[PDB]
C-alpha cells in the first residue's frame, strides 16, 4: 500500500554538506504531515524536524538555522539538505508521516548518515580451518574473520544470497584502531566437507570492494 | 482611556495555555497556521 | 525539555504470558504518550494511539495504560512475532521527545553454548599481530559469560565482543569474541585458553590449545 522509499545519506568529513530525499508510494506527500528523525545506536531515536500540511516548518533547537527541509509536490517526494554536519551525529535517519498530533504511522527503510575525518577502507579476510572436534557429528561449523575496514556495514554472502540457511554472522564491532570488524559462521554436513566447493563473498559498500575467499578443510598439523 | 478608534473587534475562543504563545504577530503554529492569523503590524491587545 | 524513562532495563519472559512495560516522564502530562515497536534492523512501527487507543493493523493482545506521570504498556498472550525492542515518545508538547527503549525476549529453555577456539591465520601472524578467536553458538541465556586465559593467567580484558539478537528458529544466541596481542607478546606465553560460564552447564567449561600446535 502506502510506502516511503528513501536514498542518500552516507559519510562525509566534518564540516561537509549532505542532501537526502525520500519518495512515497501512494500518499501524495502534498496533503500530509512529513517528518524526519534519526537513530544513533545505544542512544535511541531523536526528533529532527517536520513539515505541516500548510507548508510551514519547525526544527529542534540544536539545529536551528542548520537543518533544512523542502518538498516537491509534483513527485510526492520529500527533500532534506544538511550542512555543517558535526561529530557524533552519525546515525540512521527516517522519513515519517502522522495523523493527529504527530503519530508517526508509516515509516521508510531508514538511511544511514555518517561523519568522521577518517576515510573509507576495505575489509580483510582471514579464514578459520575447522577442527576435528567441530566436525564431530552430521554437520560441522566453519567460519572466517573480517576486520580492518571502515565505514560499516559490510555484507557477507554466498551465491549472492541463495542459501539463507545455516549461517550465523555476528554483529559488527568498532575498534580502538578506528576501523570496524565482524565475523560469520556457516554450517555444512561433515561429509560434504571434502567435495562441495566453499566460496564466501564479502561486500563493503562505501569502499565498493567485493571480497571472495575460499573455505577449505586444511589441517592443524602442518 | 484617552484615544478614539473607528471600530473595535473582540474575538474570543477557547484554547490551551501551551498554544497561548501562538497568539502574537508573525508567529507560526497549528492554531496560528490553521485557526487564527494575525497581521505583521497588528495593533491591539491580547488577553487570556 | 521533558525526559522519559522506560522500565525495566530488559524484558525476559516466555510466550503466551502477559507483558508489562512501564514508563515515566519528567513533567506530568495527560494522555500525551505513545508506543513504537522495532524488530532490529527494520522500520519502527507505531503501536498505540494515545494511552489506550490501538491502531487498526495491530491485534488485540496489546493494551496501553497512562496517568499523570506514570505510564505502562501491557500485552497478553506473548508470541514469537513479538520479540523486539519497545520505545516511548511524547505526542504532547515541549517540543516532542522520546524514551530510552526496552527489549522483549521470548523464553523457551536453557541451552549451553557450543564452544570452539580457532588459532590465528598465517596472514595475521605474517602481519606482526596475533589474535585468538573463541566462538559460542546456540545458547540461552544471552547472559553467557566468556573469559580468556593465557598460561592459566586471566586476560579477559583484551577483547571487544558483540552478540547477535535472538534466533527466531532456535530461541538461542551466539557470541563472537577475539583475543588479540602483538606477535612478541603472543610468543611470550605458551598456552592459550578461554573460559565460558553458562547456566545450562553444571560448571563453566574451558577449552585450550598450545601455541606450538600451530
Q: Which residues pair with C24 in a beta bridge?
A: C5, C70
Single out the residue of C100, C3, C86 nearest to residue C47, CA to CA.
C86
Question: How far, in Å, CA of A156 to CA of A183, rounded?
Answer: 9
Q: Helix, strand, or coil here: C176?
A: strand
Query: Which candidate in C43, C131, C165, C214 is best for mutational testing of the A interface (most A CBs within 10 A)?
Result: C43
Please spell the DSSP secondary structure of A158-172, one letter per residue.
STTTT--SSEEEEEE
* The three cell numbers locating residue B7: 471600530
Single out the residue of C8, C3, C12 nearest to residue C108, CA to CA.
C12
Return the half-sphere exposure (C-beta side, CA atoms, 13 A cut-off) of residue B20.
7
Q: How close B3 gets to chain A, by Cα (Å)?
A: 38
A56/B contact by beta carbon, under 8 A: yes
- Beta strands per DSSP E along C55-99: 62-66, 70-75, 84-90
Record: contact A171-C176, CB cut-off 8 A: yes
- The residues near C28 (Cβ < 8 Å, ≥ 6 apart) are C68, C69
* The three cell numbers locating residue A101: 498530533
Return the half-sphere exposure (C-beta side, CA atoms, 13 A cut-off) of residue A113.
28
What resolution in angstroms does the PDB record give? 3.9
**What experimental approach yielded this model?**
cryo-EM
Question: How far, in Å, CA of C194 to CA of A150, rounded?
Answer: 29
Record: contact C161-A46, CB cut-off 8 A: no
Query: Which candidate in B28, B31, B35 is best for mutational testing of the A interface (most A CBs within 10 A)?
Result: B28
Question: How far, in Å, CA of C156 to CA of C49, rounded?
Answer: 47
* The three cell numbers locating residue A91: 546515525
Amino acid at each position: 500500500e502506502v510506502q516511503l522509499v528513501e536514498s542518500g545519506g552516507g559519510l562525509v568529513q566534518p564540516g561537509g554538506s549532505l542532501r537526502l530525499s525520500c519518495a512515497a508510494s501512494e500518499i501524495t506527500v502534498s496533503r500530509n504531515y512529513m517528518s524526519w528523525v534519526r537513530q544513533a545506536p545505544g542512544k535511541g531515536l531523536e526528533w529532527v524536524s517536520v513539515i505541516y500540511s500548510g507548508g510551514s516548518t519547525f526544527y529542534a533547537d540544536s539545529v536551528k538555522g542548520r537543518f533544512t527541509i523542502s518538498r516537491d509536490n509534483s513527485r510526492n517526494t520529500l527533500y532534506l539538505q544538511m550542512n555543517s554536519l558535526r561529530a557524533d551525529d552519525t546515525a540512521v535517519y527516517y522519513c515519517a508521516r502522522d495523523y493527529g498530533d504527530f503519530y508517526f504511522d508509516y515509516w521508510g527503510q531508514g538511511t544511514l548518515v555518517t561523519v568522521s575525518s577518517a576515510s573509507t577502507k576495505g575489509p580483510s579476510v582471514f579464514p578459520l580451518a575447522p577442527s576435528s572436534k567441530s566436525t564431530s557429528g552430521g554437520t560441522a561449523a566453519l567460519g572466517c574473520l573480517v576486520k580492518d575496514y571502515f565505514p560499516e556495514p559490510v555484507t557477507v554472502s554466498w551465491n549472492s544470497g541463495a542459501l539463507t540457511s545455516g549461517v550465523h554472522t555476528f554483529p559488527a564491532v568498532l575498534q580502538s584502531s578506528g576501523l570496524y570488524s565482524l565475523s560469520s559462521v556457516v554450517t555444512v554436513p561433515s561429509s560434504s566437507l571434502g567435495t562441495q566447493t566453499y566460496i564466501c563473498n564479502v561486500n563493503h559498500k562505501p569502499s565498493n570492494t567485493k571480497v571472495d575467499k575460499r573455505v577449505e578443510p586444511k589441517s592443524c598439523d602442518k | 482611556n484617552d484615544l478614539c478608534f473607528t471600530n473595535v473587534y473582540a474575538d474570543s475562543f477557547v484554547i490551551r495555555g501551551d498554544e497561548v504563545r501562538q497568539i502574537a504577530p508573525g508567529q507560526t503554529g497549528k492554531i496560528a497556521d490553521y485557526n487564527y492569523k494575525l497581521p505583521d503590524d497588528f495593533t491591539g491587545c491580547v488577553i487570556a | 525539555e521533558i525526559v522519559l524513562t522506560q522500565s525495566p532495563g530488559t524484558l525476559s519472559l516466555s510466550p503466551g504470558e502477559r507483558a508489562t512495560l512501564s514508563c515515566r516522564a519528567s513533567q506530568s502530562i495527560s494522555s500525551y504518550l505513545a508506543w513504537y515497536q522495532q524488530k532490529p534492523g527494520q522500520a519502527p512501527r507505531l503501536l498505540i494511539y494515545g494511552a489506550s487507543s490501538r491502531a487498526t493493523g495491530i491485534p488485540d493482545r496489546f493494551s496501553g495504560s497512562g496517568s499523570e506521570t506514570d505510564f505502562t504498556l501491557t500485552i497478553s498472550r506473548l508470541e514469537p512475532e513479538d520479540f523486539a525492542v519497545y520505545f516511548c515518545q511524547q505526542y504532547g508538547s515541549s517540543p516532542r521527545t522520546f524514551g530510552q527503549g526496552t527489549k522483549l525476549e521470548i523464553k523457551r529453555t536453557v541451552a549451553a553454548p557450543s564452544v570452539f577456539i580457532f588459532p590465528p591465520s598465517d596472514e595475521q601472524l605474517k602481519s606482526g599481530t596475533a589474535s585468538v578467536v573463541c566462538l559460542l553458538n546456540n545458547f540461552y541465556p544471552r547472559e553467557a559469560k566468556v573469559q580468556w586465559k593465557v598460561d592459566n593467567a586471566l586476560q579477559s580484558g583484551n577483547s571487544q565482543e558483540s552478540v547477535t539478537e535472538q534466533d527466531s528458529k532456535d530461541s538461542t544466541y551466539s557470541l563472537s569474541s577475539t583475543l588479540t596481542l602483538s606477535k612478541a607478546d603472543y610468543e611470550k606465553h605458551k598456552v592459550y585458553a578461554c573460559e565460558v560460564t553458562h547456566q545450562g552447564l553444571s560448571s563453566p567449561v574451558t577449552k585450550s590449545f598450545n601455541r606450538g600446535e600451530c
